[PDB]
Design a protein around this ligand. Structure first.
Ligand SMILES: C[S@@+](CC[C@H](N)C(=O)[O-])C[C@H]1O[C@@H](n2cnc3c(N)ncnc32)[C@H](O)[C@@H]1O
Length: 328
């Protein structure tokens, strides 16, 4: 026994066994199905136009028949749309990026099909750099909107977890490459499935994504010293990293090129940094730091609004200090 949803672009249908599984207290396969149909409707006007017909909510996530009736109405509409494209009508553009709303849904779907046992992610040594925590879709969305990127950029998420930040960025921008490196076995293992599921579902919806790679590794290693040096945009959720690891990261950001940028949950240099005779060796001498605007309604455990910081490699700061010394 099952449930099938045909792809709007001919990819292999999505098959859900019955009974539909539950992902967590607020997410189950039944709702995923309904939302997926809703979103494909957003991709295809004619499809949405056909789904209005009679579907007066007469479906209940409990009954197989009731769900099978929903899927079938969706599937029959997809067949007609497919015939419609054989006619004169223009077939949906295949190399487009997903809208933000579809992307949120897609990542939710990929996650649920990938992180089967969410609890396992918390099995980490507390009070260590291994502490797990996920950056909200919204913040990543904010970063993407504020930190403009181009096909010239190289994006890296240091300590990528199951890799959902990399996936969102790869789906939203056109960097030459996106990388995620994660050290712990658990999140890294899940990342392999996140990766497969993601590519599979993007194909299913007919949406394009930039190049990306999810890697198992240690970003403090020798290999990464240079890779970091060549990265133009680094995202790093270092809230629980600690002074030791942050110090080491600073030692590595010191080799980045001008205009290179770093977005993190904990600043690598004071915001009020004033270069003087005692702090010449400080990383703050070669970078501008600013606090990104907080997203309205966003309370972290600290009770205050969640905060992220943008650092921009700017050696002009240092150059001017020395000039100021040739005077005054
Ligand atoms: C807060 S989690 C990241 C969650 C995901 N990056 C996000 O933004 O939602 C931080 C990750 O850093 C990783 N990490 C810590 N030290 C690392 C190292 N030296 N090399 C690679 N990953 C490391 C951990 O294993 C942990 O999963």
């Amino acid at each position: 026994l099952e449930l099938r949803l045909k792809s709007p672009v001919g990819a292999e249908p999505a098959v859900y066994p019955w009974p539909l599984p539950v992902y967590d207290k607020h997410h189950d396969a039944a709702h995923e199905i309904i939302e997926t149909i809703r979103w494909v409707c957003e991709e295809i006007p004619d499809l949405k136009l056909a789904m209005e017909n009679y579907v007066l909510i007469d479906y209940d996530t409990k009954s197989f028949e009731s769900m099978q009736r929903l899927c079938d109405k969706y599937n029959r509409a997809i067949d007609s749309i497919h015939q419609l494209w054989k006619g004169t009508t223009q077939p949906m553009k295949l190399n487009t990026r997903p809208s933000t709303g579809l992307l949120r849904h897609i990542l939710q779907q990929v996650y649920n099909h990938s992180v089967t046992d969410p609890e396992k992610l918390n099995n980490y040594e507390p009070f260590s750099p291994e502490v797990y925590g996920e950056t909200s879709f919204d913040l990543v969305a904010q970063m993407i909107d504020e930190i403009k990127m181009t096909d010239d950029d190289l994006f890296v998420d240091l300590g990528s977890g199951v890799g959902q930040v990399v996936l969102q960025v790869a789906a939203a921008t056109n960097c030459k490459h996106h990388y995620g490196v994660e050290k712990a076995d658990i999140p890294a293992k899940y990342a392999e499935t996140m990766d497969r599921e993601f590519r599979k579902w993007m194909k299913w919806y007919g949406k394009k994504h930039a190049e990306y790679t999810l890697e198992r590794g240690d970003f403090l290693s020798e290999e990464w010293r240079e890779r970091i040096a060549n990265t133009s945009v680094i995202f790093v959720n270092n809230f629980a990293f600690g002074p030791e690891v942050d110090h080491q990261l600073k030692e590595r950001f010191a080799n980045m090129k001008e205009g290179g940028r770093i977005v993190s949950s904990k600043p690598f240099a004071p915001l009020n940094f004033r270069i003087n005779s005692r702090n010449l060796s400080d990383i703050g001498t070669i970078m501008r730091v600013v606090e990104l605007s907080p997203l309205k309604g966003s309370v972290s455990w600290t009770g205050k609004p969640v905060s992220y910081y943008l650092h921009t490699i700017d050696r002009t700061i240092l150059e001017n200090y020395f000039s100021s010394l040739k005077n005054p």
